[PDB]
Amino acid sequence: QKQKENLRKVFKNKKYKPLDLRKKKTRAIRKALSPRDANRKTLKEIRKRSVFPQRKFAVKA
């Protein structure tokens, strides 16, 4: 453990950590679109969002 924790801080602020320091989770969620990258927004999508906010009404008689 002392060898493995000591290898992690020598590998901080470096891109390309070694494979066995790279957060195993699955293979299926490892290949798929890092949660920033799913939420990239085309300028059509971040212009039609900011114009018309969804309002909070009550159509009640």
Binding site: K31, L33, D37, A38, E45
Partner: protein, 135 residues
């Protein structure tokens, strides 16, 4: 057209099945093009293709692929949708443009059988025995 690959020796059984040399595939030749690409380049997703030229023993095409792990395509919110997993091998499941041709999907009347979603899921649901609880 596709010659049924029967062993020289018959398609046995009834004469209805006895046909060897006028059979035609239910798939295209364009769809058969994209397959033999996308089979072979297992780590690149297919987008479409187009005819480019032909001569008389070889119709031949031009397939568009997309690596889905290059960052310039992962960053790209206009092309990003093919990076999802639900598009793995998206034409071995029939789903390009030139794959959806041979299924038969459309609307309405003329494409009625088959309207269950695809084409096989219609005969599942046409033939479905509903054994209701309160007969």
């Amino acid at each position: 057209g596709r010659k049924r690959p029967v062993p020289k020796g018959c398609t046995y059984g009834k004469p209805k099945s006895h046909g060897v040399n006028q059979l035609k595939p239910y798939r295209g030749l364009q769809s058969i093009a994209e397959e033999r690409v996308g089979r072979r380049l297992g780590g690149l997703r297919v987008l479409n293709s187009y005819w480019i030229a032909q001569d008389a023993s070889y119709k031949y095409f031009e397939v568009i692929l997309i690596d889905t792990h290059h960052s310039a395509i992962r960053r790209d919110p206009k092309i990003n949708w093919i990076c999802k997993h639900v598009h793995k091998h998206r034409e071995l499941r029939g789903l390009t443009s030139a794959g959806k041709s041979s299924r038969g999907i459309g609307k309405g009347y003329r494409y009625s059988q088959t309207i269950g979603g695809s084409r096989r899921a219609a005969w599942k649901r046409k033939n479905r025995e509903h054994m209701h609880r309160k007969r």
